[PDB]
Design a protein around this nucleic acid. Sequence first.
RNA 1: UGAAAGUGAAUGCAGGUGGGAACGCCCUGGCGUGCACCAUCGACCGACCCGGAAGUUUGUCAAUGGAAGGGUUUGAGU
RNA 2: GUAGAGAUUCUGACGUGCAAAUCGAUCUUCAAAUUUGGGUAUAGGGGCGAAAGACUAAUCGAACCAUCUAGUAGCUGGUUCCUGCCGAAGUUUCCCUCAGGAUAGCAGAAACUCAGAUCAGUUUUAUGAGGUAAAGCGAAUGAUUAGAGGUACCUAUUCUCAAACUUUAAAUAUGUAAGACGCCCUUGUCGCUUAAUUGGACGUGGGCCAUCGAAUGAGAGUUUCUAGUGGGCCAUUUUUGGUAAGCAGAACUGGCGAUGCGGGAUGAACCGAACGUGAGGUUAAGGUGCCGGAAUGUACGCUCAUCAGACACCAGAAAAGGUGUUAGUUCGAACUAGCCCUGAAAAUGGAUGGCGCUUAAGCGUACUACCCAUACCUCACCGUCUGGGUUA
RNA 3: UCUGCCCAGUGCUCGAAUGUCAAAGUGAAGAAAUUCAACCAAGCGCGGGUAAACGGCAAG
RNA 4: CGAAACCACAGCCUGGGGAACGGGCCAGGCAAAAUCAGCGGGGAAAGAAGACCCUGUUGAGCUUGACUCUAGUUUGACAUU
RNA 5: UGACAUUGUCAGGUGGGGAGUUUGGCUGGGGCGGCACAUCUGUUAAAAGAUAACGCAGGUGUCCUAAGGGGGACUCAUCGAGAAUCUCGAGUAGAAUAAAAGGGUAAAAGUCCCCUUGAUUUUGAUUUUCAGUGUGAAUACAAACCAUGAAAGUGUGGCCUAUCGAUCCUUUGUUCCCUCGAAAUUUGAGGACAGAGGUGCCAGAAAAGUUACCACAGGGAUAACUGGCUUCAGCCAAGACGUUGCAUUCUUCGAUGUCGGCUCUUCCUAUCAUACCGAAUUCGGUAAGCGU
RNA 6: GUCUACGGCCAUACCUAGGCGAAAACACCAGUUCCCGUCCGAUCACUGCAGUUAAGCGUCUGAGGGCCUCGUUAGUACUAUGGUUGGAGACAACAUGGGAAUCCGGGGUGCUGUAGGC
Lengths: 97, 158, 170, 54
Amino acid sequence: VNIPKTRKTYCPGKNCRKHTVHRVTQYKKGPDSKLAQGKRRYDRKQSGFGGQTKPVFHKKAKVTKKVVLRLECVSCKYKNQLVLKRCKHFELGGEKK
Amino acid sequence: HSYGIRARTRYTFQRGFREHGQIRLSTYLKTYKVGDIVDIKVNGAVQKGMPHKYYHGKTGVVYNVTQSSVGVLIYKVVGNRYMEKRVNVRIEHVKHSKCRQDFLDRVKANEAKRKEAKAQGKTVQLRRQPAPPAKAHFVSTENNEPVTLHPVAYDTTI
Amino acid sequence: PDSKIRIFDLGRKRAGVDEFPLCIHLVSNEYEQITSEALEAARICANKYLVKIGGKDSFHLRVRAHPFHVVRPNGLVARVNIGQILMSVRTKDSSRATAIEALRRCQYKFPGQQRIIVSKKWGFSQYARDEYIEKRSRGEIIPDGCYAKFLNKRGSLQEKLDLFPEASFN
Amino acid sequence: KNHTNHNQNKKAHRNGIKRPQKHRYDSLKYRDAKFRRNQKFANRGTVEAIRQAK
RNA sequence: UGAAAGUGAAUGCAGGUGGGAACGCCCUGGCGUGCACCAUCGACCGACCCGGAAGUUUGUCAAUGGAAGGGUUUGAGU
RNA sequence: GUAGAGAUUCUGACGUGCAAAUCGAUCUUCAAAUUUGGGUAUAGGGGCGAAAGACUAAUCGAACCAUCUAGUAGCUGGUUCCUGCCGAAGUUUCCCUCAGGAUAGCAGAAACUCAGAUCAGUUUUAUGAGGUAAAGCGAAUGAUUAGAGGUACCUAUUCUCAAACUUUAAAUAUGUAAGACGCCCUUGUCGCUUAAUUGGACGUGGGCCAUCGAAUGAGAGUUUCUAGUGGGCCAUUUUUGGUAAGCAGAACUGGCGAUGCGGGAUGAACCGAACGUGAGGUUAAGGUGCCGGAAUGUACGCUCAUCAGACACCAGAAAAGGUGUUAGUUCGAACUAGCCCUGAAAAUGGAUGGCGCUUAAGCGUACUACCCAUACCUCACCGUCUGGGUUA
RNA sequence: UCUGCCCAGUGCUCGAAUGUCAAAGUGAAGAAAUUCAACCAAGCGCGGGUAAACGGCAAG
RNA sequence: CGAAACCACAGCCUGGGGAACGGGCCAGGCAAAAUCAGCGGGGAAAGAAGACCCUGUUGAGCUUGACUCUAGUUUGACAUU
RNA sequence: UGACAUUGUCAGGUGGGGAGUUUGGCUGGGGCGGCACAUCUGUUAAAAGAUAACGCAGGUGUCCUAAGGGGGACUCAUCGAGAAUCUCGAGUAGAAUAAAAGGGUAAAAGUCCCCUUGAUUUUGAUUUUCAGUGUGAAUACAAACCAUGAAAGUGUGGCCUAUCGAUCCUUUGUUCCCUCGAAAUUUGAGGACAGAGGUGCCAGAAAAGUUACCACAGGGAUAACUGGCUUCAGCCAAGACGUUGCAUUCUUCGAUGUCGGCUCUUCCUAUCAUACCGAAUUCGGUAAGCGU
RNA sequence: GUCUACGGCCAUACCUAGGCGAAAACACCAGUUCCCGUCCGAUCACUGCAGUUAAGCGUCUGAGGGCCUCGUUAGUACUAUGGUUGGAGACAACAUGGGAAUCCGGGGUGCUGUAGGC
């Protein structure tokens, strides 16, 4: 699916409270931090004899992810997030029909 | 089985034969108030605001009025109780119950008879009564002499 | 599946409506089923007997049960009600005995019970003998191949006039 | 037997298909918001005007 | 009441409305009167979304502070 | 070949033995990888094994002892006095759930509230909704027989069909209404709505005011906690898969399960009727030759069977015939029916229940009398519940 | 009396890429916690040997 | 002189119905003490909570490139130095 | 021989030699298959709603910045007529409408053009599956913000009926937010609020075999084994054609000993022989006494 | 009564052939500078009344097609309930009730509301 790189949509930032142009990009999951509480608890739990202490997931059944649009206000820099339907092939600002 | 919203709705949501086309506009020119008793008849052309197939042919009382729809309250048997179902149904799928209008016309007539009975100093029995057995009557035979009939002999028509 | 019986009219199927006045029906007496192979075997028996006795020009035979009901695909059968006509033979008044015996022999090819009934209607038409005579007498019946056209009060006038010149339009 | 609806209607009618209790006043909440707002103000003036008349 | 920081329950006879126990008055009702309980419309307290009046001192332009007022949102509240 | 060490066969004896492995005969070896005493070493996830998972104190695909340990139990078994009162479920949704739980239903208790209300597995009246049966195919669609006409066609016809074709369209089911939370008039609030006190919603103040607005019958309703249940089965009718099935699967209702009694000889669901302890009377279903309570009753016929028939469910037979016979129909001939016979055919001796029954004690119809259930009726008594009294 | 053919695979065995490479240690950034960057044995991986190795009939 | 197994109660058949092969139930055939030696038709005879099969979120033996580990082994680092 | 090497600690790799565990369910027994395990249309289905089978005919894990939204003009599939692809007649949809099927659609919901991003933010209320829990999908509004149109109005994705996801954890957005509890500042972390990442066994364990050496607790809820039920003789005329007849899982898994032969007795007739008849040795009828 | 605008019910209104239509209205019609749109002012947009009732439009006619209503079909098919009814069954009959559809035949061929013009 092709999504235009820019769109005029409502900006819920308090400085805008109106429709404003937003730059559209694709949300990328951030790098996992070693110092998160879950990561720290996992390292504490995994240290020592006992083998594996947590479920490890294999039965990956989904083939595509919900694409997430990161809307970025041109005026007040406010950032919004929209989720769309699942798509196998995704374009951002491709050629119009 | 499949359990969609419009499953097995081929005949009930179908538009009538030679009744297809454009919806008549007296539907939109009608007024509904809360307390009105209305019938639900899902018009298949208008897909927005369609109540579920259970409510087709169901009659209820209006409880809410919006710009384009009507809130109808219907009692649906669920296991061992009637549960209050409040469907937001578009006015195309709605019509006034003629039974209510017949009742209101009868109420107006009853008040009229009561007023005239009071004015005349008489008592008028306002309860309807079921059909009674026929009265005694004479049946005249003049120019209507009885014709004696016998069962016909069996024959092979074809 | 293909039905075993393929021909459904035998004899002079082009015979005029006036030529064969007598009609004899082999009628099912029971609510039952008839197989396609049963229908064609009785058809062969009826055609063989009738052509042997009176010849191919003395009768018109029409089997009216069509094997349209599928049995569960392997074959086709004819679902028959009570009183439904299975076989029909139209002949002259002389061939009454021949047609009756032919249907009597063809009973043995069909399961269940059948009755031979001499229909009081003229030939294969729906009109009884007396009303067919009287309507033909006053002129609303015109033969058309194996059947006859009947004047009806509906339609235009000039077209009915030049198709039916003897008709007396009151 | 995986499924049947044999004894279910009997079980329903033993305590009867009971109807919900009828109340004179139903929630003006859960209705149209604009109507609810104005009816609050209309009710508030009505009770005050009754009080003033009394 | 909220995750917390924190804030923290009377516009009114501690409101209206409907039905209601018991009582009173009148000629069976009517009229008052309404406990208890539900239906419901509000008021108040905390969150949530706005709105920032004072006031405090420290950055007075500000920093901090939160009043009135509005949402028809919410709580295991008054 | 003997002693000795073995243990092939009889698949002999015995097989609660003499014996928890023995005896008899037969057989294998018999001077060496031989047989064997005592001493000594190797101990349990170990030993030892010319290897069979063999052996390791009658215990070995992990010895024995004691403890953890009363290990765990969706699994099997059992679970102890009486009467009275009420009385289920095998269904819903979710679960690594399918022999199990939770959840809803059904049930019991304990309360509270309302009240001529507030309703009903009901009818009527009024008014909706549906696409099944039926019908149709010369109304579209699909399939299909035959000629006629005008030229692969076209036109008027014709025979026959559809579970996912259909214009049409039932019966049975199903929704709602049938007033006092009513109606009529006046009039008030609003930030909503309108061109507008214009409406809409809620009200005030009045008037109408239990034939108060169909029938019939009932007092009605709401909380709280919790049990058991979450294998069902049969029949009526409808219906699917199946060659069929005492087969598998559903729908509606009634039953059995949980239920005795009368009857069908006998039987969980068939027929009748549902049950406190009794007396009398009367019936239901079904019966009245004898077993067996009760007419070897009445009336009119049919039937003769060389292995007749005899009561629903039900414990089974068809086409087609039969100089069997009794009646009919239409022109002696054909048909048409009712009974009988034929078609009809198994294995312990045996089944209308038996005995027997032939102008029946068989079959069809009609009419009386009779017999009898725990059902009905009257009465007595027991208990339960409900209602009304009781400060003498 | 013979014991054939096959090193593809699998297993065993022994030479080179430098592709990988943990903890140490080295360099930079930060106030540090640390975050980056480069290097690293073994095992690999690539390459040679091996069937009286498993196996097959890469060889048929 | 003197056991034991086994034992709901018992013990003549045919048929019916029935959890679809009754000793009992229903309808029949029938039916006279007390016993002895034989016998193997029946008592679906006795002998062991089927040892085949399935079920259980019950095991164990063995196997492998199952999951997860571990003795050992191997290499790097620091220590000893 | 030698600061090598061995040892102690750590970090890589190896490790069925050894340890512990697991090895989904549904299922006309299990197993193999299929996925009926999450879901849509038409049926099954008996004209409300509900309704089953490893019943039936196809589908779903996508696709689309337009194929979403608004406005405007236009009319479609066809068929006839005719000019070296457009021409005009008829044309109730016989076409198209992303994708299965069903329904809807004609100055449109189809086809072209024009402008857009309602495929937005924030509540509550409803509908369907339903326990009236959750998820999913949907409906009517209210408070903003917009698109479009002259306007009425329409628009909270697709004409309607499918196209999907908890706790924990991780990550992202938001606030000039809260906390790190002796007091601070800067990092870092933890919170509230809104999403995403994934559980297809789709209300969501992290899991290979084998057992003929096998073991338990059960099961006739469930197979094998025993039982039961179920699946040649005419009629017809041209001996053909026809037509009518003679798997299930109820019992048993606290066990009913499970082929054949031998032995032995009995019954049956659907008669090989024997007796006695009827036709033209052969075909028949009576016939199970007797033998085989 | 006729005509126009806006409608309601949405074929008794539609389709086809033929014959009429006085007034006004309506329509066809003249033109392309303007607003506007096209390959083409043919459509659409704009300005006007020189002619025509030829068409549209109204109406009458066809035992026209269709459609609508009534009767026939027909108390028929079907169906709720009932029987220890019949029949081996298929199915049928009866009892107390409910009750169609096609063919066919007759009639009909739009009614009406508001504001106006004649």
